[PDB]
Amino acid sequence: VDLGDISGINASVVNIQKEIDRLNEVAKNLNESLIDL
Amino acid sequence: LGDISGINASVVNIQKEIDRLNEVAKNLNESLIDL
Amino acid sequence: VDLGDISGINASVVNIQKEIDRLNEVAKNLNESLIDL
Amino acid sequence: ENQKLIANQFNSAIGKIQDSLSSTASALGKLQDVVNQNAQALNTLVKQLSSNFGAISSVLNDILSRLDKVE
Amino acid sequence: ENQKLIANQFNSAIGKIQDSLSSTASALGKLQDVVNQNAQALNTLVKQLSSNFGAISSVLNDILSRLDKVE
Amino acid sequence: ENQKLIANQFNSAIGKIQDSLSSTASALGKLQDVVNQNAQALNTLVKQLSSNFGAISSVLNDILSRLDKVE
């Protein structure tokens, strides 16, 4: 009996930490763009 | 046979964030300039 | 011997390419909203 | 004149940002829905697999016992 | 002078918002790609598992029948 | 007066956009965490399933051989 091989079934992982860090960085830097007449 | 019942897949709840996004997209009408 | 049927187990796919295209389109069009006094 | 230009450009940019925020909310909602459906799918698969492996185990123990009885 | 300040701050903010929109688009594209790959992985796993469980079932029925023939 | 209106509306809009960017970052972080946890879950399931199917295969080969010896 030779059951089918499934070890090739792989689930990728996502790394969007650069993008989240950029989003928080921009949300912090937008204070430098406020207008103070 | 090996036990696999511990294998659990979490669920995500970002409905607060989606609601905030739609709320801001609606509230940005109050920030339009009317000279 | 009858083993349980699992063929109904389906995993959906997401298609948010319209939204990503809109995001990139807006990021490109925001150049037309810059102020040139 | 320059004030009208500033106001018009600001209103245009705010409209575009509103469109982008609606698009981000839609995309995040769709991603949430699909991730949660796949989580439920993996959980149901783990449950059914636990059941089927228990059943196979019971049948295998029975067959081994009945072979022990044979020999 | 104040108009130039308003215009400069607005252009800076629009540049930062453009960066943020590009980052959100990149993140959403990566999340879409990975969620779809994992969906395909779970679907392929369900298919192969259905196959293997059918095979185990056939072998088990054969073994049970051959034990019935033995005894 | 109109400059003060422009500045106030711009500051309000920038505050709202900051809130929206923080919300998008939070949502993307949560989606990343859950997608990665489900990826690890599917990988662990594939590993354990490979193990259990190897074990079932060994037991099945043994049972078939022992039935061959019986008959």
Numbering used by the authors:
A (entry chain E), C (entry chain F): 1164 to 1200
B (entry chain D): 1166 to 1200
D (entry chain A), E (entry chain C), F (entry chain B): 918 to 988
Sentences from the paper on this structure:
In each case, the process of viral membrane fusion is mediated by the trimeric viral spike glycoprotein (S) that is cleaved into S1 and S2 subunits by multiple host proteases upon infection. Two heptad repeat regions, HR1 and HR2, distant from each other in the prefusion S, drive membrane fusion by assembly into a six-helix bundle. This HR1HR2 bundle formation is thought to provide the energy for membrane fusion and is therefore a target for therapeutics, as exemplified by peptide inhibitors that disrupt infection by the HIV-1 (19, 20), SARS-CoV, MERS-CoV, SARS-CoV-2 (23–25), human parainfluenza virus 3 (26), and respiratory syncytial virus. We therefore designed a scaffold to efficiently determine structures of the postfusion HR1HR2 bundle and its mutants to near-atomic resolution by single-particle cryo-EM.
Our high-resolution wild-type structure of the HR1HR2 bundle resolves uncertainties in some side-chain positions present in prior structures. Overall, our wild-type structure is similar to previously determined structures of the HR1HR2 bundle. However, some side chains that were assigned to different positions in the prior structures are clarified in our EM map. Consistent with previously determined structures of HR1HR2 bundles from SARS-CoV, MERS-CoV, and SARS-CoV-2, our EM structure shows that the interactions between HR1 and HR2 involve an orchestrated network of hydrophobic, hydrogen bonding, and ionic interactions. Most of the hydrophobic residues of HR2 are involved in hydrophobic interactions with HR1, with only one exception—V1176, which is completely solvent-exposed. Another notable feature of the interactions between HR1 and HR2 is the abundance of hydrogen bonding between HR1 side chains and the HR2 backbone. Thirteen out of the 19 hydrogen bonds between HR1 and HR2 are formed between HR1 side chains and the HR2 backbone, and only six remaining hydrogen bonds involve the side chains of HR2, including S1175 and S1196. In addition, two salt bridges, D936/R1185 and K947/E1182, are formed. Note that the HR2 fragment is synthetically linked to the HR1 fragment in both crystal structures, that HR2 is naturally linked to other parts of S2 in the postfusion EM structure of S2 (18), and that HR2 is not linked to any protein in our EM structure of the HR1HR2 bundle. The root-mean-square deviations (RMSDs) for the backbone atoms, side-chain atoms, and all nonhydrogen atoms between our EM structure and previously determined structures are relatively small.
